[PDB]
Amino acid sequence: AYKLVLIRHGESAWNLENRFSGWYDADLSPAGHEEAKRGGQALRDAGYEFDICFTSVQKRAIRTLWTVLDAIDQMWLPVVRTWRLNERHYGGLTGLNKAETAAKHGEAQVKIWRRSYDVPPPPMEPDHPFYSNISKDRRYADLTEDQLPSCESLKDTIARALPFWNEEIVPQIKEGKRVLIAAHGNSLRGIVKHLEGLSEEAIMELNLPTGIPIVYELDKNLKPIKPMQFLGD
Amino acid sequence: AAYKLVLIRHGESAWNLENRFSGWYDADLSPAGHEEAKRGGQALRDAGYEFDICFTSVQKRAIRTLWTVLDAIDQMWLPVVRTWRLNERHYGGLTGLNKAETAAKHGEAQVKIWRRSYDVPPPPMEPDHPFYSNISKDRRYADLTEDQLPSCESLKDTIARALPFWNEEIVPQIKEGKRVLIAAHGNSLRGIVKHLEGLSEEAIMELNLPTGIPIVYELDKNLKPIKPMQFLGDEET
Numbered sequence A: 001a002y003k004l005v006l007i008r009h010g011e012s013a014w015n016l017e018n019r020f021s022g023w024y025d026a027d028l029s030p031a032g033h034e035e036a037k038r039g040g041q042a043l044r045d046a047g048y049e050f051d052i053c054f055t056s057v058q059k060r061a062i063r064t065l066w067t068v069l070d071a072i073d074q075m076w077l078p079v080v081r082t083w084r085l086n087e088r089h090y091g092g093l094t095g096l097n098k099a100e101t102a103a104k105h106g107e108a109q110v111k112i113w114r115r116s117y118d119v120p121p122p123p124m125e126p127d128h129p130f131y132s133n134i135s136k137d138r139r140y141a142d143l144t145e146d147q148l149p150s151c152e153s154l155k156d157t158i159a160r161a162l163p164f165w166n167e168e169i170v171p172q173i174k175e176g177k178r179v180l181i182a183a184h185g186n187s188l189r190g191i192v193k194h195l196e197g198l199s200e201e202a203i204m205e206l207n208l209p210t211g212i213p214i215v216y217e218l219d220k221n222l223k224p225i226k227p228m229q230f231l232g233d
Numbered sequence B: 001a002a003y004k005l006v007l008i009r010h011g012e013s014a015w016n017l018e019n020r021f022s023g024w025y026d027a028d029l030s031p032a033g034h035e036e037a038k039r040g041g042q043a044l045r046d047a048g049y050e051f052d053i054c055f056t057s058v059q060k061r062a063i064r065t066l067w068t069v070l071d072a073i074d075q076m077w078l079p080v081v082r083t084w085r086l087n088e089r090h091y092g093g094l095t096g097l098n099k100a101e102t103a104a105k106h107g108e109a110q111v112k113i114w115r116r117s118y119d120v121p122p123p124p125m126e127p128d129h130p131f132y133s134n135i136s137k138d139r140r141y142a143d144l145t146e147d148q149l150p151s152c153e154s155l156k157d158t159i160a161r162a163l164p165f166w167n168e169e170i171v172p173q174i175k176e177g178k179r180v181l182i183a184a185h186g187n188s189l190r191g192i193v194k195h196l197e198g199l200s201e202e203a204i205m206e207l208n209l210p211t212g213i214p215i216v217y218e219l220d221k222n223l224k225p226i227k228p229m230q231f232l233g234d235e236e237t
């Protein structure tokens, strides 16, 4: 019965300003850092061991992983980073707060986005304040023109995250390697929806806790044998 | 030049504080060693250095130095490759002893040989040794063949198992134009330097690389260094 472990990073610096970060590379707030320390301790106390870790190219996820590996004394483990585990690309809303967003786009469009699985946000246009910061970052230089989003619905995020699951994480699990994935709410949502065969409405209702190891027990077909469980007190 | 290569040797370890031989023991950085890695990463920030792939050992003093550097230069997203072949020199049965216990147990004639000799090993680390199961039975070495796991290493041994990684995994990256950072240990970095500069056994045993200092190489199309190694930072350091 394979064991798989997910962890979602905690509060960021832009949460403290209630700003949409998306692909903006906000660091953890001091408290999000503390959350990751606690998640680490909870894996230490339970005696968890891994053989390989996956994360995004965003530092709130990476620092969460680093904190956990420090806590469980497995700093030596192989680490693989991919943009395909990044947060959902919130396009033109990147950097705005909720008030600014409602003023610019309307309460109507806002409710549509909050409820919808396949309606993207506005694209990040070249005049956007963070257009260069994100879409001209080196770390994305290898992506083709069609892979680099200017915005993403949840469906888009999941559609680009699941190829990485199948391509690099599934082979490790098949070999018996114990996997730890440190990433973001929306990419992990993709993983959860695929593992559990959830519906659109279901996954959009699922909200993953932060800083808490999420444990999956998988059968030989990598199908969950029971619902996800959490680690801690 | 054709290529830029940066090396960095980690600072003080927790066992440097007890004057104990570390080798493959996975001692963490002391607070001063952590501070040194911060200063080196800052010197890389201020010079605006960029990397595309990082190599390091499987020892947390090297790894943590690398993490601190990547943090300082806002490049935590870079691919990181860890390998035992960049590990510190394995000090065999001397692991855990201080200088005085080593002299008492082994004698002045023997330590004198051990300090001036490129290719005489320390005593092997036997199963009765207090750190044998901590090191040799660490699951992180469980994929090494029997002949690869050392019980002890001369400097020549360390260099001998470091150079194949340099040749097969690092050199292809350099030749692809990728800008490499290597965060490792004095004796493994010594291997890389001796191969890069064609230094003699004598010259490499007299070369002590500064800790916490970015070491910059400019290499030609044949990965030959075009000038002496350079250190980045305030003149003070």
Ligand SMILES: [Cl-]
Residues within 6 Å of the ligand: A079, B080
């Ligand atoms: Cl890493």
